Amino acid sequence: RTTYMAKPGEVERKWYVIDATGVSLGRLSSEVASILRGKNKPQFTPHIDTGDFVIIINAGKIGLTGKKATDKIYYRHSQYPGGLKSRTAGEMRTNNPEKLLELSIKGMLPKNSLGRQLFKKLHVYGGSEHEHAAQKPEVYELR
Amino acid sequence: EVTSAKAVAKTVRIAPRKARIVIDLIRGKQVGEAIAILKYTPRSASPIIEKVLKSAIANAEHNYDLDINNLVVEEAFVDEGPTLKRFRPRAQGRASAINKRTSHITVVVSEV
Amino acid sequence: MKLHELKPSEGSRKERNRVGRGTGSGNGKTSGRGHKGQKARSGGGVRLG
Amino acid sequence: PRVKGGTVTRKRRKKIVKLAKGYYGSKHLLFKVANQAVMKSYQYAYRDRRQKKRDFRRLWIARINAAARMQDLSYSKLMHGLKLAGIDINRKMLADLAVNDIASFNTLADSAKKALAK
Amino acid sequence: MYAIIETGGKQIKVEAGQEIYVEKLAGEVGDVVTFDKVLFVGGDSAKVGVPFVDGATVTAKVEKQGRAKKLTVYKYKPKKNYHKKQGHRQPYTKLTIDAIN
RNA sequence: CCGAUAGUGAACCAGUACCGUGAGGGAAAGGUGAAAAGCACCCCGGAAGGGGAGUGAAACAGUUCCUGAAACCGUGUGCCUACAAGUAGUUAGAGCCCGUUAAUGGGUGAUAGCGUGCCUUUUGUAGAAUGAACCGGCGAGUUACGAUUUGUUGCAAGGUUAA
RNA sequence: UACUCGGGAGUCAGACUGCGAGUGAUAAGAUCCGUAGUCGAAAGGGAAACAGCCCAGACCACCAGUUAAGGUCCCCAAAUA
RNA sequence: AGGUUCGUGGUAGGAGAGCGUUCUAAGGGCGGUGAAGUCAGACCGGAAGGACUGGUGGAGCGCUUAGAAGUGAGAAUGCCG
Numbered sequence: 001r002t003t004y005m006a007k008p009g010e011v012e013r014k015w016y017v018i019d020a021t022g023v024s025l026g027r028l029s030s031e032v033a034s035i036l037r038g039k040n041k042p043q044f045t046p047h048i049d050t051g052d053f054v055i056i057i058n059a060g061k062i063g064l065t066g067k068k069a070t071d072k073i074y075y076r077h078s079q080y081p082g083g084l085k086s087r088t089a090g091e092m093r094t095n096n097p098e099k100l101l102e103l104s105i106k107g108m109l110p111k112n113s114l115g116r117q118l119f120k121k122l123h124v125y126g127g128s129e130h131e132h133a134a135q136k137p138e139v140y141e142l143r
Numbered sequence: 144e145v146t147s148a149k150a151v152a153k154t155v156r157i158a159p160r161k162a163r164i165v166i167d168l169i170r171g172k173q174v175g176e177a178i179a180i181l182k183y184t185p186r187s188a189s190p191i192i193e194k195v196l197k198s199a200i201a202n203a204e205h206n207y208d209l210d211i212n213n214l215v216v217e218e219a220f221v222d223e224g225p226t227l228k229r230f231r232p233r234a235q236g237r238a239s240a241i242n243k244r245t246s247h248i249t250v251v252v253s254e255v
Numbered sequence: 256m257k258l259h260e261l262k263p264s265e266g267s268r269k270e271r272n273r274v275g276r277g278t279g280s281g282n283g284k285t286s287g288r289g290h291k292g293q294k295a296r297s298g299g300g301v302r303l304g
Numbered sequence: 305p306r307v308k309g310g311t312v313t314r315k316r317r318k319k320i321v322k323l324a325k326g327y328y329g330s331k332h333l334l335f336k337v338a339n340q341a342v343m344k345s346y347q348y349a350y351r352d353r354r355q356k357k358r359d360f361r362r363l364w365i366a367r368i369n370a371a372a373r374m375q376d377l378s379y380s381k382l383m384h385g386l387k388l389a390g391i392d393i394n395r396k397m398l399a400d401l402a403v404n405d406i407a408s409f410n411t412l413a414d415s416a417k418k419a420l421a422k
Numbered sequence: 423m424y425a426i427i428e429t430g431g432k433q434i435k436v437e438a439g440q441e442i443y444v445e446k447l448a449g450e451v452g453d454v455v456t457f458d459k460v461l462f463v464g465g466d467s468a469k470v471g472v473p474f475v476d477g478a479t480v481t482a483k484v485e486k487q488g489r490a491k492k493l494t495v496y497k498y499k500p501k502k503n504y505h506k507k508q509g510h511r512q513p514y515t516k517l518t519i520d521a522i523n
Numbered sequence: 524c525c526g527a528u529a530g531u532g533a534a535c536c537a538g539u540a541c542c543g544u545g546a547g548g549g550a551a552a553g554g555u556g557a558a559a560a561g562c563a564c565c566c567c568g569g570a571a572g573g574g575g576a577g578u579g580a581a582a583c584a585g586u587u588c589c590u591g592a593a594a595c596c597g598u599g600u601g602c603c604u605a606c607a608a609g610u611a612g613u614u615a616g617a618g619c620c621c622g623u624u625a626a627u628g629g630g631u632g633a634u635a636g637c638g639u640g641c642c643u644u645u646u647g648u649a650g651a652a653u654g655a656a657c658c659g660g661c662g663a664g665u666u667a668c669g670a671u672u673u674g675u676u677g678c679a680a681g682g683u684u685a686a
Numbered sequence: 687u688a689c690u691c692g693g694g695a696g697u698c699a700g701a702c703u704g705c706g707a708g709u710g711a712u713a714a715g716a717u718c719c720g721u722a723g724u725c726g727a728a729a730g731g732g733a734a735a736c737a738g739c740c741c742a743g744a745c746c747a748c749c750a751g752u753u754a755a756g757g758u759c760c761c762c763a764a765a766u767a
Numbered sequence: 768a769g770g771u772u773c774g775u776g777g778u779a780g781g782a783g784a785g786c787g788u789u790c791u792a793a794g795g796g797c798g799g800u801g802a803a804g805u806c807a808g809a810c811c812g813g814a815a816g817g818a819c820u821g822g823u824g825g826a827g828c829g830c831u832u833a834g835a836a837g838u839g840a841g842a843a844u845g846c847c848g
């Protein structure tokens with residue numbers, strides 16, 4: 001019958017800038033993933049993109065409660081026999097905070113083609129100034 | 144009317160897969176260039192396709208009164224025909240089948 | 256009676272049952288015989304007593 | 305009298321092969337695989353005919369929740385207030401109001417807030 | 423101006439001049455049907471029912487009595503020699519909305 | 524009673540061809556048209572084979588020639604497709620292309636949710652248990668005489684004939 | 687609902703779970719009995735995936751509503767109660 | 768014929784109602800202004816199934832009521848092409 005479905009390009013997508021100072025990693029990532037997915041609008045449609053674009057600054061000051069800064073381990077395998085690598089959450093917050101935020105958030109998006117397409121809308125900076133001043137980005141305050 | 148002519152060679156002793164590799168070269172080309180292409184392609188199916196093409200051009204000029212210089216090859220395809228079944232004696236007193244295949248060759252020429 | 260409207264007495268004739276014509280009739284694959292016995296074989300069964 | 309099997313088998317098999325039109329490869333040409341494809345398609349349709357209602361209710365609930373969060377309410381609080389006030393509009397129509405006539409949705413949310421606090 | 427009415431066990435949104443399909447109703451072609459269960463009247467005056475508004479009703483005219491397209495309900499169980507086939511056709515009634523009160 | 528996988532093994536030069544030292548075993552193969560009127564003549568080619576012309580009701584009936592299904596092999600085009608982990612579908616669904624036995628129509632489908640073939644045998648099989656390359660035809664509870672039980676019909680302390 | 691009379695069968699390889707015992711080592715997805723359930727012959731929801739565990743028994747259609755086990759930060763519907 | 772109440776998962780298996788194929792008998796039909804067969808469609812019935820229209824085909828075939836069976840195939844390392 002009659003139920004509204006959006007169309008590609010129908011819904012206006014905005015740009016948001018978020019400060020990541022002192023917020024826990026997962027608690028920031030959940031909010032950002034919900035924003036990206038498009039679940040904050042009454043025009044949500046499961047099979048198309050209606051989410052917004054997110055810019056994250058001060059990524060080097062993300063929080064890690066407990067002792068996660070020294071024994072939260074990230075693994076990679078090169079598919080060669082005995083090719084496992086490990087890295088702590090610390091020294092990954094200091095060297096490559098962008099990878100930390102990116103993979104933490106990527107673990108929360110849907111695991112399909114639309115999720116990969118959504119991940120391309122996330123820009124994260126470890127400093128304080130972004131390169132996208134030409135867009136308009138507006139400040140967003142986490143719930 | 145009758146702007147096209149065709150010729151067919153039926154039940155020619157040549158496997159269809161070996162003629163459908165030469166006849167793909169001359170599709171949609173001028174008749175002079177197609178004859179030249181068939182002349183310099185050293186396969187075994189070139190003389191047969193060339194003969195069929197020249198017959199098609201000849202009966203396009205004679206019956207329907209068209210111009211040789213203004214012709215192109217519209218359609219060209221190879222269709223299957225009856226196969227002859229033969230045998231080849233393998234080792235240890237048993238034989239294996241051999242398929243001597245034939246084909247039908249068709250070419251259609253027309254005004255540009 | 257007219258030969259084009261013959262009607263035998265109701266209840267006096269019935270339809271034969273045919274086994275082994277598909278599973279929709281309830282007498283399909285095994286045809287009312289069960290599974291893998293002596294009584295499930297062609298010409299099977301034992302003497303009367 | 306002999307009854308030779310003509311015209312009846314092909315007529316029945318062609319119906320299935322026609323029902324399997326649009327499938328990949330031999331699934332739309334050969335009877336044996338087309339029969340399995342048709343049975344599986346019927347079973348899938350039977351099951352999805354029940355899952356469709358569940359999916360649409362989930363979609364309506366998500367849209368209503370998203371629209372209500374903009375009025376400082378959850379979905380849970382809004383539905384409780386609507387049930388407490390005495391309003392019997394289902395999720396489909398609330399979602400419609402949320403998508404288009406948002407003014408009316410905000411009026412209903414005001415009614416729910418009035419009943420909830422009260 | 424639109425309204426939300428309840429009919430056939432489910433609610434439907436209507437407007438003047440709109441054509442709707444509902445569950446089978448008692449009435450011949452050309453008759454007039456009145457829906458007295460109105461839940462919400464909107465447009466420049468948002469007055470809601472608790473659960474029904476008031477003596478406000480909706481009137482409509484019958485256009486056609488018929489049945490929908492044919493389904494085919496099929497069930498089977500692998501390896502158990504069980505199949506079941508059955509066709510369905512759902513009756514309906516087609517109306518045209520006249521006025522909203 | 525059968526109607527060319529049927530009916531004799533054999534509807535056709537069949538106990539033939541073929542197999543075996545021998546006794547012996549043992550096939551496949553029907554249909555132009557009412558009438559050969561079976562394509563004079565012209566063109567390409569060595570020929571085969573084609574394109575015209577002609578006979579014919581029909582040649583898309585041209586010497587396995589009535590009808591001509593499926594597997595299988597091709598030519599053209601409307602929609603989709605080179606960042607994507609797929610028992611291949613089903614439900615939701617935009618875009619593009621059409622226009623029906625006219626009715627809440629047809630074709631293709633970017634994207635999203637769900638989803639481990641069919642049969643047999645098993646306590647239990649998606650099963651790394653078994654069977655099937657695909658398509659077509661053929662292929663399995665029958666008849667005779669007795670026993671017993673239910674239904675129908677005729678007569679009824681009688682009923683009924685066999686040769 | 688029982689029972690009696692008559693026509694027709696199939697079945698006699700069972701499986702796991704809770705409780706009570708034996709053999710075993712107070713082992714086994716072991717083996718053998720008593721008792722109740724489910725599977726066999728049962729789809730649907732939860733245990734990630736899952737015959738036997740927990741909830742619950744599919745006549746057909748609906749873009750309607752209330753609940754059971756289990757759950758409400760994101761994948762993923764609902765409390766960053 | 769109309770109601771009230773209770774029901775309608777299902778393997779082995781029991782009971783009931785039917786669809787379709789070939790032939791026979793009677794009645795009534797259509798067909799060179801085109802039969803059977805074959806091809807394509809978005810039609811009809813609760814299922815097996817049945818029509819209508821158009822192309823090819825070029826001479827036989829339905830319908831109603833009964834009767835008789837060489838009576839319906841996807842599987843047998845099934846037989847033939």
Ligand SMILES: [Mg+2]
Nearest residue numbers: 234235236237
């Ligand atoms: Mg040998």
Ligand SMILES: [Mg+2]
Nearest residue numbers: 234235236237
């Ligand atoms: Mg030798």
Ligand SMILES: [Mg+2]
Nearest residue numbers: 270271272273
């Ligand atoms: Mg019967």
Ligand SMILES: [Mg+2]
Nearest residue numbers: 280281282780
């Ligand atoms: Mg049964």
Ligand SMILES: [Mg+2]
Nearest residue numbers: 277278283284
């Ligand atoms: Mg079977």
Ligand SMILES: [Mg+2]
Nearest residue numbers: 285289290291
């Ligand atoms: Mg068996």
Ligand SMILES: [Mg+2]
Nearest residue numbers: 289290292294
């Ligand atoms: Mg037995």
Ligand SMILES: [Mg+2]
Nearest residue numbers: 305306307789
């Ligand atoms: Mg006969």
Ligand SMILES: [Mg+2]
Nearest residue numbers: 309310313840
């Ligand atoms: Mg057959």
Ligand SMILES: [Mg+2]
Nearest residue numbers: 326327631632
């Ligand atoms: Mg498709």
Ligand SMILES: [Mg+2]
Nearest residue numbers: 526527553554
């Ligand atoms: Mg024949």
Ligand SMILES: [Mg+2]
Nearest residue numbers: 527529530533
């Ligand atoms: Mg014979």
Ligand SMILES: [Mg+2]
Nearest residue numbers: 541542543544
């Ligand atoms: Mg000899």
Ligand SMILES: [Mg+2]
Nearest residue numbers: 554555556589
């Ligand atoms: Mg003759």
Ligand SMILES: [Mg+2]
Nearest residue numbers: 570571572573
């Ligand atoms: Mg000649």
Ligand SMILES: [Mg+2]
Nearest residue numbers: 562573574575
């Ligand atoms: Mg000639």
